[PDB]
Amino acid sequence: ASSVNELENWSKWMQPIPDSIPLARISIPGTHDSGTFKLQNPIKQVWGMTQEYDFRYQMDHGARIFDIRGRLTDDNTIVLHHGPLYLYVTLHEFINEAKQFLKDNPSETIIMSLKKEYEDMKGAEDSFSSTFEKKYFVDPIFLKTEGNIKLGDARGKIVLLKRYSGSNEPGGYNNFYWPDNETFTTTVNQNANVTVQDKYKVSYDEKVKSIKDTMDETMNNSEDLNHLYINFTSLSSGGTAWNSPYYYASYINPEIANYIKQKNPARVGWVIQNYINEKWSPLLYQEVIRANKSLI
């Protein structure tokens, strides 16, 4: 029906968006350190938890991008980690969850970002990349197309955003530089450029500015279909005393959500946040999705 109302369905919001629009152009809600939701021990919670609900919950709240951090085991499987902390979640669990969501809502697509979080468990046969490629990537859900991937091709599939080196299988978005604690720009492939604001471990003030300035850039460089803009709102600092990603998220989330609503942009980019829920005032993920009214 191509109605703007259809964006209101957090479980089917990409449905109204045209097939020819590059994913890069679409404004997408995403979560940071997505697999940290099973942590219960208060110490590991004030240190590693960045989400409080599961993968399926996150997706039903609009999230389509996932920050998956892996670790190679002796059993030659990949499990989710957060630093040296074993998250009681596996890659199979995530993919399993992604497939069931895509089964229910085939109009949707989920973008999976994969990074190696901790060193290979001494005893594994293969390396991290080959193990991921032989055992998992080989599954059909994974889109094997490259370039400036469009919505139409990715529908009902999982698009990879490689954040590991050593790939030997075409598919998704190639791996790229990505320097530590910074905002930068590079080229993914021959059909796409990237701009990433990933200033984690920085002052609350410097962070908010960095988010807003990167968002202003995308706001004005809106129609540039060949440009990726990944804006991380997530922020971590020396916790153990109200300095947790949770304290920051409670402020930054409504802050940015309002900023979006107020500005009413045509493009906000790929906004990767911590703690996706229904507690904060304006709702970040909702404003990000609504900014796609432009494409309709």
Side-chain angles (χ1 to χ4, degrees):
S2 66
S3 180
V4 214
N5 300 125
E6 301 175 50
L7 291 184
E8 247 45 66
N9 194 336
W10 297 352
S11 300
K12 292 180 155 64
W13 72 266
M14 300 178 125
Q15 170 188 49
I17 300 180
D19 282 57
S20 63
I21 298 308
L23 297 189
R25 177 74 236 284
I26 306 171
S27 293
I28 321 181
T31 60
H32 167 247
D33 270 306
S34 319
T36 56
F37 64 87
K38 284 176 185 178
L39 304 169
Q40 294 171 268
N41 309 256
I43 292 184
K44 305 184 305 191
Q45 285 196 345
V46 301
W47 272 109
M49 191 180 220
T50 61
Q51 303 295 326
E52 57 190 321
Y53 298 108
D54 60 33
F55 295 122
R56 181 57 179 240
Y57 173 101
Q58 300 173 35
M59 304 172 172
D60 285 318
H61 277 59
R64 299 288 178 269
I65 300 165
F66 297 78
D67 183 23
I68 310 303
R69 307 302 183 84
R71 206 254 172 119
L72 223 207
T73 69
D74 283 343
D75 321 292
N76 309 294
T77 59
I78 297 182
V79 298
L80 310 202
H81 250 54
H82 191 138
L85 310 184
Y86 164 63
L87 298 175
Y88 285 64
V89 185
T90 70
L91 215 194
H92 273 128
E93 181 170 354
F94 174 71
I95 299 170
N96 157 250
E97 283 283 56
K99 287 184 183 162
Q100 245 72 273
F101 179 70
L102 295 179
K103 197 86 67 178
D104 285 302
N105 319 281
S107 67
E108 306 304 275
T109 183
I110 94 97
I111 298 165
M112 188 197 134
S113 175
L114 215 207
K115 178 168 163 62
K116 20 72 239 313
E117 190 75 348
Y118 207 59
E119 194 55 75
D120 301 343
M121 205 149 104
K122 57 290 115 181
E125 262 209 288
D126 254 309
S127 64
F128 183 91
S129 47
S130 53
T131 300
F132 167 65
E133 294 179 339
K134 297 171 177 182
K135 270 69 176 297
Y136 309 79
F137 196 44
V138 102
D139 188 322
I141 20 79
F142 286 109
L143 210 212
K144 307 299 192 302
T145 309
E146 292 191 324
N148 196 21
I149 304 156
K150 309 193 311 174
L151 177 58
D153 311 308
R155 287 184 138 117
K157 310 269 288 308
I158 302 174
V159 179
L160 222 203
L161 196 159
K162 313 187 205 288
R163 284 200 60 190
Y164 61 88
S165 49
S167 181
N168 316 269
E169 290 293 349
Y173 301 114
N174 287 215
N175 185 50
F176 51 84
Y177 183 31
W178 205 309
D180 197 34
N181 196 357
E182 191 65 67
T183 155
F184 53 94
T185 184
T186 17
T187 74
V188 196
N189 46 258
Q190 68 167 312
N191 283 167
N193 273 345
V194 233
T195 288
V196 176
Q197 180 276 294
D198 192 42
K199 267 175 178 177
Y200 74 93
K201 186 82 290 181
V202 92
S203 77
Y204 176 98
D205 298 292
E206 227 255 85
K207 182 59 173 189
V208 187
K209 173 186 177 298
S210 305
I211 291 171
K212 295 174 175 177
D213 281 14
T214 308
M215 213 170 111
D216 279 336
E217 227 235 68
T218 97
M219 225 175 291
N220 287 293
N221 192 224
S222 53
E223 297 321 281
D224 185 12
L225 319 188
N226 320 320
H227 202 117
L228 274 294
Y229 283 104
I230 306 176
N231 206 330
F232 285 80
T233 66
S234 56
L235 205 189
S236 68
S237 288
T240 8
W242 259 147
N243 201 7
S244 75
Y246 191 82
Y247 191 61
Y248 286 117
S250 44
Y251 282 112
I252 305 179
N253 288 337
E255 167 89 86
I256 306 306
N258 191 238
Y259 184 85
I260 296 179
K261 196 160 201 168
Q262 223 64 264
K263 292 241 181 184
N264 165 66
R267 165 142 109 144
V268 293
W270 291 3
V271 193
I272 320 313
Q273 55 159 127
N274 270 355
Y275 288 98
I276 179 163
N277 60 42
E278 291 183 62
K279 299 178 187 177
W280 313 141
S281 311
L283 294 194
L284 228 192
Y285 53 97
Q286 180 171 30
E287 303 313 327
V288 174
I289 294 166
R290 281 190 177 138
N292 289 293
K293 66 180 78 251
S294 170
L295 294 173
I296 304 178

